[model samples]
Target: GLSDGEWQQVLNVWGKVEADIAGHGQEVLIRLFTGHPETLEKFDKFKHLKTEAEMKASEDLKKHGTVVLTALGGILKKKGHHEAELKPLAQSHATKHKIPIKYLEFISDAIIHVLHSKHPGDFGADAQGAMTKALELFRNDIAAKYKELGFQ
Candidate 1:
């Protein structure tokens, strides 16, 4: 586990990075992870998949100092207000997807570059379709992979 000081450093870095993105008129990034042991083990099981395509795609973004934003999901309930406020707390420089580049810069730019892009309307449509498809594939892949490993 990360120490308190180390954790704070992580939070500080991601917080600024996301804030910068938000300032650029772009929505913050969201990354989802599971606490399941099998899932985590599978995630750890995969070795480095640094392919040429991935390296090429990441070159530009790396120069710009990209940030990976994630939420810390916890239960916060009070007497009258039993609400689940999944909010941002920290960020870090972590590779989202390897090899083929799971997170494309243009994908995120869609939400930020509303006025400049040629296909403004297309961004929304494409993003929606892309996210839906990607999420399903990713979800199934991890779940199936975990099950195979007998993660109960």
Candidate 2:
């Protein structure tokens, strides 16, 4: 759970981050795939990208990245009460893809990196901590669902 102070900090920074949701999402995916090649291999369409330039230009990857962030936008809006929203996604990944939790963590890191790099003033040290804790909440809930589905 995000404490009141932390949640406030996140909200203060989210405005800057949310300005270009689709762009930010795509950038996050780019960093994640480039920073960690294994995560890119999980996607059949994305795995073929051999370079960061390909990843940046791929419309398919961009579309999926936007989708990812759109879902995340709703989740962020709901904040702590996002279990219902996350359940189906969790189930899909756990039962169908068996996507490991570490990939999710990687995405989280990429997202924070983008937000920080883009808006260093807004996402300062304290706000970054709050954002990290907030993302971890989402990760933990998704992990619980994975556990329920007999995966990890």
Candidate 3:
């Protein structure tokens, strides 16, 4: 899901990152899991879930997201000198998970700038603004996917 420029940048990062992580004896793989024989039944049931249940599921997903991110941060901290050693892992995982890497690239870059940059000006005055935009973009992308997947 990378645009031309974004694809260029992502591939550059991915190639270097993959090689570096491979040096550390880590291999990243992506797998697709569509549950089992109950897949269609589960989908139909999900479609019939009450509004409250749907809302709670979304809320829980949001909270669980924080837990996952925190766990990943712990991994980076353990990596010490090469905390970004997880970048390739994350990228490959995203790819395996069918996430659009270009959309995530913008998200990831903004995060790196905000969290790791030495100077506030490094990300510019509107870095926060860009972050907001990226988040909205992600939301819209998810909405579109929901529609495509027959979320009605």
Tell me each candidate's TM-score.
Answer: 0.24, 0.92, 0.28
Could you give candidate 3's per-residue lDDT for residues 66-151 as a string of tens digits? Answer: 44344433433332232254454444434444444344444444344433233345433444443344334433544444445443
Positional deviation of 115 in candidate 2, in angstroms?
Answer: 1.3
lDDT for predicted candidate 2 compared with the true structure: 0.84
- Roughly what TM-score does model 2 have, to 2 decimal places? 0.92
After TM-score superposition, what is the CA distance of residue 101 in candidate 3 from its true location, in Å? 2.7
Clashing pairs in 3: none
Clashing pairs in 1: 14-91
For model 1, the stretches where C-alpha displacement exceeds 4 angstroms are 1-123
Could you give candidate 1's per-residue lDDT for residues 1-152 as a string of tens digits? Answer: 23344334433433333445432222221111111122122234222323333433443333322422222101111111212321111011122322111233333333334222433454344344433333343333444444444443
Better of 1 and 3 by lDDT: 3
Model 2, range 1-152, lDDT digits (tens) per residue? 88788888877777775677778878999999889888877788787899888888888877887799888877877869887899999998888877899999999999889987877675678888998998999999999888777896
Q: Sorted on lDDT, highest at the top, how do the candidates line up?
A: 2, 3, 1
Give lDDT for model 3: 0.36
lDDT of candidate 1 vs native? 0.30
Please, what is the whole-model Cα lDDT of each candidate in the order they appear?
Answer: 0.30, 0.84, 0.36
lDDT for residue 7 in candidate 2, whole number 0-100: 85
Which of the two candidates, 2 or 3, achieves a greater TM-score against the reference?
2
